């Protein structure tokens, strides 16, 4: 990684281990993206790609970087043309053979560290928070509670599934601004 000023990019990178609903909160989830990112030398601002009590997944990326700046993976490969494109309501269709990588470089969708290939997002297809399904703002992992998740094997990044919070799923980290 070396990128150019007139060449903006935002990385969607995965946390190194699957996590249940009991994420200690977004403050706790946010801190893990931070640690892991700088453990591998990444100079950006990483926030947990989730919808919480006081925020929508949409509002993680600063306005100036929402309309054009491409969303790439840890390998710089293209995921989404832009953030608006992602949150336009098509539930982020993963293009043919696109792959997401964890900070330590594992291909999340094909590595045994992630038995369950779903992503925790707690949002609707337009990146808005769902207070009835975001594991009580990622504080609980009670099987009775549920969080919005997407099945990477269903080809989407924002599929809609109220999933039991005891589940250890993938958690993503979006660089908040290039």
Annotated binding site for Zn(2+): 1, 3, 11, 76
Contacting positions for Zn ion (CB under 5 A): 1, 76
Binding site members: 1, 3, 11, 76
For 2, 104, 123, 151, the CA distances from 8, given in Å and listed in that order, are 11, 23, 26, 28
**C-beta of 1 vs 38, nearer to Zn ion:** 1
**C-beta of 11 vs 66, nearer to Zn ion:** 11
CB of 105 vs Zn ion, minimal distance in Å: 13
Element (H, E) at 32: helix 26-39
Q: What is 149-172 written as a DSSP string?
A: EEEGGGTBSS---EEETT--BB-E
CB of 42 vs Zn ion, minimal distance in Å: 8
Q: What is the DSSP letter of 87?
A: T
3-state secondary structure (DSSP) of residue 55: strand
**C-beta of 1 vs 111, nearer to Zn ion:** 1
β-bridge mates for residue 12, sequence order: 174
CB of 119 vs Zn ion, minimal distance in Å: 21
Closest-by-Cβ residue to Zn ion is: 1
């Amino acid at each position: 990684h070396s990128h150019r000023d007139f060449q903006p990019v935002l990385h969607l990178v995965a946390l190194n281990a699957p996590l249940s609903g009991g994420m200690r909160g977004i403050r706790g989830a946010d801190f893990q993206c931070f640690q892991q990112a700088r453990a591998v030398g990444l100079a950006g601002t990483f926030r947990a790609f989730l919808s919480s009590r006081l925020q929508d997944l949409y509002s993680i990326v600063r306005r100036a970087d929402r309309a054009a700046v491409p969303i790439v993976n840890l390998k710089d490969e293209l995921l989404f043309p832009s953030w608006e494109a992602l949150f336009s309501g098509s539930e982020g269709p993963l293009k043919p053979g696109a792959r997401i990588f964890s900070f330590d470089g594992k291909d999340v969708l094909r590595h045994p560290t992630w038995p369950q290939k779903s992503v925790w997002h707690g949002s609707d297809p337009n990146g808005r928070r769902l207070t009835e399904s975001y594991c009580e703002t990622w504080r609980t992992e009670a099987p009775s509670a549920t969080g919005q998740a997407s099945s990477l094997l269903g080809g989407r990044l924002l599929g809609q599934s109220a999933a039991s919070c005891h589940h250890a799923y993938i958690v993503l980290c979006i660089e908040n601004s290039f």
